Design a protein. Structure first.
Lengths: 205, 203
């Protein structure tokens, strides 16, 4: 049986990891942790991720080693398989750099656009504008980089995998990609990948 | 000097100066003014296209640029062999807690700073959101520090990434009351000579 257990949900951060597993050809078992039933607050899950959030993996081939944080899981799996991140000093760092730009920039800022534009009890246009403008600014950084190279770190890598599930939902966040020709190219390339398509359907709705 | 550091007196800048001081690597400091719009200067955009500090240029490695504080910490740890284990599990524990800082503590406490200190309007719902979340993340750190001395076990770049933020909790309007493990760790970090040195950079 699969030696990776995946705890996930249908969110951009969960899709980062299912896409990566699908790209790498790694078998895995899915646990769609039930937030409806408070499973993320149970002691059992908190021994895997003390933050009580998805995604998280348990590597059963490695003494049931737990890995939390989507970006840390991507690094762990890339290193395990030798795929989707170069091994030389500069190539590896370029991937980690763009991965961190996603983890500290794209994801947090676009997530706050989601909060204020879609979920917050009252409409705070100053906050909505702040995060929508910042997300667009980050998208323009991505677009400029994608004029220099086909993928963010050169060859396709876990950095692209981390970034795509957020860029994909730009309209939910109220942020446009129009005018960003290189980012649009990259979106179309990512969307056409079978492994991306499969990863986006995990966990089954 | 080996490393050229482009920085400012912010928590994210302090992560990297603290790391350099811990590792004993020679470096030069370029302090960038947010007022003079030095972040926007084209030469700096060639180093970090995001136009933010910190960034390094490794003069010992073909003037290779590294941006993103967390990625700089990883690059330097790997370069020197310090402050992150080389075994699979030890290395991953550091990366996990580093990502918790980069995706969680830094962004959320930074948003607390925005609405509590700098935003033009007082938006109490936004202040509460980010002060509550920052405190929740601090409680996660406190729980972990009850089972390990430092976040990944031994002292590592994950602690260096996290401390410059926790250090300014009162500026963000977030208390550490009741978090005895976090307070122990705060005192240990504050006492380290290299932490003290790195907090002085830039002047």
């Amino acid at each position: 049986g699969p030696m990776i257990d995946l705890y996930t949900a249908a969110t951009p951060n969960g899709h980062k990891v299912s896409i990566a597993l699908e790209e790498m050809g790694l078998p895995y078992t899915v646990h769609a942790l039930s937030f409806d039933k408070k499973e993320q607050k149970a002691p059992e899950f908190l021994r895997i991720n003390p933050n009580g959030r998805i995604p998280a993996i348990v590597d059963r081939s490695n003494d049931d080693f737990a890995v939390f944080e989507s970006g840390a899981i991507l690094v762990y799996l890339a290193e395990k398989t030798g795929q989707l991140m170069p091994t030389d000093v500069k190539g590896r760092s370029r991937v980690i750099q763009w991965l961190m730009f996603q983890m500290g920039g794209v994801g947090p800022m676009q997530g706050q656009a989601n909060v204020f534009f879609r979920y917050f009890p009252e409409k705070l246009q100053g906050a909505i504008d702040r995060y929508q403008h910042e997300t667009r600014r980050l998208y323009e950084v991505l677009d400029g980089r994608l004029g220099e190279a086909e993928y963010l770190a050169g060859d396709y890598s876990i950095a692209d995998i981390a970034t795509y599930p957020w860029v994909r939902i730009h309209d939910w966040s109220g942020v446009a990609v129009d005018g960003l020709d290189n980012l649009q190219r990259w979106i179309a390339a990512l969307e056409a990948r079978p492994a991306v398509q499969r990863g986006l359907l995990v966990p089954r709705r």
